[PDB]
């Protein structure tokens, strides 16, 4: 009951941070997500108690599928294989599904077929500085700080499909590891409005009552 309130027992929890779908034959279906913790409100409030963080990263992908309605005549398909490409900060980025930026040798990718354990991969502390800065009072556009940029993830099918359209949905789970935290900070009171900045609309201090006595 003494160690439940430590830092590693507070932040090393898994959390779903992104959810997207993609079809194979559409020439518009392939996923994309920049790695940041500023999308979901329950993970963002825990990381914003501290100014400087430094943690390893660990991701897990739960990919399913569906059989979208085809025309006719005996749909039978083999197992599907997916590619999950990680783009380090300062790398090439795809614009279509069929592109030369998938095949580059410095963007590490994982391949995985349906029916196995989900594809974990782990990313160390990748930054030029010494800590990720959750709050940055300055310019690079105000309060951006491109020095804590963790990379981008792209997903696509590798199987060419002929008889049936198949859409697939991927959920990404997010887990800090070996967390260090510096310079504590008060917890947020107003609601979050945008992702990039810290803008708000003013709110009362607390819930009110009728009398002081």
């Amino acid at each position: 009951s003494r160690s439940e309130s430590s830092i590693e027992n507070f932040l090393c929890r898994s959390a779903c941070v992104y959810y997207a779908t993609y079809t194979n034959n559409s020439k518009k279906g392939f996923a994309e997500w920049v790695i940041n913790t500023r999308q979901v409100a329950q993970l963002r409030r825990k990381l914003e108690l501290f100014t400087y963080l430094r943690f390893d990263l660990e991701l897990t992908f739960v990919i399913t599928s569906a059989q979208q309605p085809s025309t006719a005549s005996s749909v039978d398909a083999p197992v599907q294989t997916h590619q999950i490409m990680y783009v380090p900060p300062g790398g090439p980025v795809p614009t279509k599904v069929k592109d030369y930026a998938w095949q580059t040798s410095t963007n590490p990718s994982v391949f995985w077929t349906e029916g196995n354990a989900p594809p974990r991969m782990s990313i160390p502390f990748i930054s030029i500085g010494n800590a990720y800065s959750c709050f940055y009072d300055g310019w690079t556009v105000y309060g951006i700080n491109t020095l804590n940029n963790m990379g981008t993830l792209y997903m696509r099918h590798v199987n060419e499909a002929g008889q049936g359209p198949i859409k697939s949905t991927v959920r990404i789970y997010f887990k800090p590891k070996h967390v260090k935290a510096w310079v504590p900070r008060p917890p947020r009171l107003c609601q979050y409005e945008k992702q990039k900045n810290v803008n708000f609309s003013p709110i009362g201090v607390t819930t009110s009552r009728t009398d002081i006595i």
Partner: peptide, 27 residues
């Protein structure tokens, strides 16, 4: 355990920054 996505990267070593937190009760 988990396999590392970027090995051979040689991450940035640490630094003395003032005000480290070890537990939530000291907040």
């Amino acid at each position: 355990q988990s396999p590392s996505a970027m090995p051979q990267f040689d991450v940035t070593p640490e630094m003395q920054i003032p005000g480290r937190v070890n537990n939530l009760m000291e907040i």
